[PDB]
Amino acid sequence: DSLAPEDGSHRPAAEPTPPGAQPTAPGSLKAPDTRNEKLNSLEDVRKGSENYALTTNQGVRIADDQNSLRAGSRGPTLLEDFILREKITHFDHERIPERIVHARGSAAHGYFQPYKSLSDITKADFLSDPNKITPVFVRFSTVQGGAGSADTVRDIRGFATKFYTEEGIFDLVGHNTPIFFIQDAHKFPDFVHAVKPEPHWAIPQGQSAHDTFWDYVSLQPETLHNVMWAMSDRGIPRSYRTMEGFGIHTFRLINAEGKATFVRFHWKPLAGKASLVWDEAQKLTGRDPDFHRRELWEAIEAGDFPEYELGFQLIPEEDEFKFDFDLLDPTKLIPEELVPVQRVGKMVLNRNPDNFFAENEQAAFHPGHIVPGLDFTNDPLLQGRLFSYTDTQISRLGGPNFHEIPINRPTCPYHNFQRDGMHRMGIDTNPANYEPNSINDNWPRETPPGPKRGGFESYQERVEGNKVRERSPSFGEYYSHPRLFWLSQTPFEQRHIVDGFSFELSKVVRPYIRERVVDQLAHIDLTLAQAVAKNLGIELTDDQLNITPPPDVNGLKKDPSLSLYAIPDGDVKGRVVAILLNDEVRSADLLAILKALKAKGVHAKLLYSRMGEVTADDGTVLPIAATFAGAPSLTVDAVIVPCGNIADIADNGDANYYLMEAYKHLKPIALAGDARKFKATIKIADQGEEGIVEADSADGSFMDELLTLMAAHRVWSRIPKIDKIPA
Amino acid sequence: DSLAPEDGSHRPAAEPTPPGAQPTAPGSLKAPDTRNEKLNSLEDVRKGSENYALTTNQGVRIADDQNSLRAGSRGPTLLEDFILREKITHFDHERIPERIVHARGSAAHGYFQPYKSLSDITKADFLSDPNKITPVFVRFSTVQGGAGSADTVRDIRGFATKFYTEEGIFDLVGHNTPIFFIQDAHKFPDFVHAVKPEPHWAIPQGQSAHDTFWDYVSLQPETLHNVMWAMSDRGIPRSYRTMEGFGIHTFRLINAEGKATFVRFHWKPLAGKASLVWDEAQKLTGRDPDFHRRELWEAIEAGDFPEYELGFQLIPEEDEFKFDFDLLDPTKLIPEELVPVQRVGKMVLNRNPDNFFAENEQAAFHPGHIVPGLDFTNDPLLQGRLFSYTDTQISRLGGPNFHEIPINRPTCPYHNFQRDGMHRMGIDTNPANYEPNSINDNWPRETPPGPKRGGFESYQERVEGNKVRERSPSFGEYYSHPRLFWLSQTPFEQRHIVDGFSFELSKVVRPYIRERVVDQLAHIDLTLAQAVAKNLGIELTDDQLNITPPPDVNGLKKDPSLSLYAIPDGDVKGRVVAILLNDEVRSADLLAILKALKAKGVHAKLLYSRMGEVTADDGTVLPIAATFAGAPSLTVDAVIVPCGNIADIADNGDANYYLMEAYKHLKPIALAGDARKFKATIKIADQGEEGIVEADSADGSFMDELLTLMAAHRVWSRIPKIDKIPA
Ligand code: HEM
Ligand code: HEM
């Protein structure tokens, strides 16, 4: 029709812009100059729209897209209307099955680059030269919930990276904790079914807090280590940018001379580590179920690119048997105090997709997708994974040509004798469809193994044993890793752990399950169990009080890299602040505030009790971003309240509640001049307290005190005051 | 190993029990004696479990289900482990595509029964006798969100009913408002795409508060009427039990003599109409995303069975053109003040399913499944629907034999010449697979139409017109029904409509879209338009202030049946109350309370600061159902606080906050004896106020006040005081 506004405000600028400033858009329209080899090769499937006629899928122009063909304008719809039937038919078949686990996920494009050559330890081409740039596609996700479930639930997180290398696709499919719940792949459907919604009524969504999950845990102690990680704050991250990444299993690195080294993969966040606190996370699933997906997308649009460092834990083959635990057991970690992480390269995420369904929903990752330079090991969880990812993709993606969907295709060449199958795209001209053949002179040909561009050959490991269905005796210890984890947390992190267990077990209906869990906790640590017991109204038996604790792990009694906050690594860039306005804000306060924030790279959200504009005291006009109710304190990292006509909002229930909720969730609060009246709303002493920044006006140290607290992420010293406070 | 507790507390009693007292279970173990003819025919495929051996799907007993087959205890997994591959293969293929629309839903079994014979107006066998019972299967749902989205979002609700009649299956596939958003089926994909998550980032989940939906509404004024319904409290029901249901389309009833009568279908809830308030509903999507599903399962387990009256709006064929609106326009309703609802029968839901996937997820409903005695009309929306439901079940359910999935099978006989297709169950013995045939003497055979047991014949309506793609000019009126709806609401209902519009338009990023929507509202009612506009910081122009309001609907100024609350119809039976405990409860108070609750069928939940138990002053050991934080006020209808050691919970942040939320959300609160100390937390009344029940002790008088308030659902008179409460 020609319906866009003349002034053209229906379309966002194609340049970096702060969260909420402009409408978000497909990646190639927001950042058309952000390119890589993978992005460039997708140009053959991209479709525009501007200046084109509206057509059927066969290319016939459509004259009327508002009506069906009928006999009379009030008559029956005719069967001969092929335009209507095509339109509704495509609509009716839009959906494909979601992923059996990790259905909910958010993705982006980027690139990886090695810091130096690793030709000494591996012959993988993508790690061989500091100038080789490798394009990546990454998907972050939850585990339990469906694709329409919420982002900030309590759960393990997935971290999958598809490396488009020159010698093949390499998929590193990891998680956000260094261990998994079970030892053998044979139990995966059992563990998955226990955590997922119960089979009679399909409840509950996105939660482990129900009878069957805890039943399975109390009968299978191997799950205790990863259960400790999920009940800690590791289970509710602040953002996909601020969590750690792990491969979990021990793999092999193979060099040109044929030597094998054992490796555990690590992803280290450059924005540091941060998480939410339970009541904020749970509330946040209602006020904004898409908070992580939204933050990821907006961070890239604003230029705050997620950056991670790839790291390796390296173990010589001769050291296979030197630890207290088995290296092939995925319920056990390798303490950084024993085997340091070597920082090897970096990944940067700098462009969003164009179409979620086509790039994200259809992407397929699989741990079996490795390259020459790498190899597997006998970890029994990894072993059964190799079977599963190829099999499941046959029904999810509809056939064996899933590698022909544009986001999954390699950028390097691929030729073989495989043919046909549903949805076949490639037209092969090879006269032969088998080898050995003389009709095409045996092409394509096998290629011997070598130091570069050679064929894949498996490491020749020795196997000796009988065919048995049995667990290795070295896999039989379940309590010392959990205890190592428990003793490395800070005191306030231990408290959050206790509260996660108490909360979750309180939702378990059958009381005997709660009691058996508590018993299992008494084998890990007594203080932990006494504390969980008292919140559930349980008494420990005298026998439970004398259980002997498990041993140290190779002499360690703590490892600080297991805590989120022991060794702080905060980075305030990309964090966001809430500024609550009034109808006559002191513009001198506002300019000192906004300029300090921009200097550190922190975003501001200007809030008010209605939408539209507000006029500052010097006549300056401020556009309002959202209302107090529309952008709750759950969404910001800290609150600033500037001087001005404070009586405008001193009596508004939402403005006050905004300060009580943030105060409760331990975020820093700043009050300028008469905005100090608000201290009475949160029971702050006249004297003041750590975490509340207050001054006569918003000037000098005001902003610097505020930004120091933001780098410390939350105000842990206030824990003691929040139990009162009705928020 | 891993067995049940000695006391048998792992299993639920097979008798009606209140919500939360026991673990929920599959319907056939919870109510073995509840039967109907559909439930009994499902006996062929129900599978048990106690006392059987674990096997593969080929029936081979499994010796060890904890491990994979490997070469040695720490060796590689063997390809020949067929037990392992069968187990993982089935898991890898568990998911099927979710429903294109209405993916999130909850179902139950029950039966329908007519009040009188309706053979003067219809030859429909299920309506011909008061003593004839028809088994039904009903599915309630949201529209927009995926299958793992939350229950209490703002959206339209689906109300689908499958009738297993003796002359075929009849599906009455309706909604909870009497009109739809659009007129022609050709625009369905356009409207659904605008409301669903945006295509570049897949945000937002289960919400219409985003740019593409308001864009579409502002350019298609036909949608305004159902947008009014959605922005009112009709968009957020308290329960599937407390909402109305409609077929929307005008349909036809045909009697034995061939006479036709136009009909609109209604469902009237015998528990009455009731809804949440927005703040509550949004927060409840985070505290329990599965609330409507839970509540339905639990009401059926408690014996508070969902019951509805089927009603008909009947209009003679000669009165087709006697209204100011076209009867075939699905964006127009038929005021009950003009054509009353005749009550025809009752439907009762009395049993949950055994397996949610097998019965709820594979069920297929379709508005084209009618039986002799019913017929269609030329409503252009209805007409397009007939193509769609059959088409989409071919991919969702895998082939053309979906009528052979047990939940979908007819209980009457079905025979024809259709053969083959994927997963074909029935083995045909008929030597012929075509007709006419002489080799089987032509059976099965066609049956002529008649009064009972006849073949289907369409009503022979005259069709006169040219083949055009054109909207009837009679459908070109968009503003008088929304005006009629606005003027029939109570004043507090009106405020909530304004608040829903303001809230959603505040989330639209492109400001010109808000302005256009507000412009459209000015054609309906200038008071409504002005209220929304003030909240968005928008000034109406002089031009807009002089828009002539639309005309009346056949002389009506208003119709009270369009409001939820103008004519009170509430029932307290099945509602739930929170009782906040302390460590020394006055047993006398507690017994007066529980007795009265039990007399009216009101359930109770005893809450505390920890789980386990408390002892009342006389020793009546009280088991705690959940904590304050664990079962928030959002999930109950009213709050009671008994006397006792009140200093136990007087300074508990959670217990004070609990009363402030219930107060904000207009729920009745009862305070006894020293519990009156809590009046300071909700800072109000010295002499008391309506909505707050106080007394020295909990007696008969106290309880009757509280029960009279609960029958009115919420305390509307408290609206003007909530704006100042910080909660
Ligand atoms: C170390 C333990 C494991 C980790 C870290 C892990 C990680 C992941 C991640 C991140 C995804 C989502 C990929 C995406 O974004 O599309 C995924 C999917 C999946 N995983 Fe795993 N997983 C583990 C164990 C297993 C096991 C033992 C099995 C089965 C034997 C399994 C079967 C699957 C399947 C079937 C999918 C869906 C794949 C698809 O639909 O493309 N996983 N896993
Ligand atoms: C008055 C308007 C409409 C109403 C009241 C309505 C109602 C419903 C309901 C209640 C369901 C869910 C059934 C279940 O529980 O499985 C549903 C699903 C569906 N609707 Fe409609 N709908 C309407 C308009 C349309 C239109 C115009 C189309 C297409 C032109 C359409 C296509 C579908 C499809 C394809 C499904 C999924 C069916 C399945 O997967 O089994 N609907 N609709």
Swiss-Prot record, chains A, B:
It catalyses: 2 H2O2 = O2 + 2 H2O. Residues 433-467 are annotated as: Disordered. It is found in: Cytoplasm. Pfam families: Catalase, Catalase-rel, Catalase_C. There is a cross-link at residues 366-389 (3'-histidyl-3-tyrosine (His-Tyr)). It is an enzyme of class 1 (oxidoreductase). PROSITE patterns: CATALASE_1 (PS00437), CATALASE_2 (PS00438), CATALASE_3 (PS51402). InterPro entries: Catalase, Catalase_AS, Catalase_clade2, Catalase_clade2_helical, Catalase_core, Catalase_haem_BS, Catalase_immune_responsive, Catalase_large_C. Heme binds at residue 389. The keyword Secreted does not apply. Induction: By entry into stationary phase. GO terms for biological process: DNA damage response; hydrogen peroxide catabolic process; hyperosmotic response; response to oxidative stress. Keywords: Cytoplasm, Heme, Hydrogen peroxide, Iron, Metal-binding, Oxidoreductase, Peroxidase. Its EC number is 1.11.1.6. It comes from the Bacteria. The active site is at 102, 175. Decomposes hydrogen peroxide into water and oxygen; serves to protect cells from the toxic effects of hydrogen peroxide. Homotetramer. Belongs to the catalase family. HPII subfamily. PANTHER family: CATALASE (PTHR42821), CATALASE-B (PTHR42821:SF1). This is Catalase HPII. It comes from Escherichia coli (strain K12). The lineage of its organism: Bacteria, Pseudomonadati, Pseudomonadota, Gammaproteobacteria, Enterobacterales.
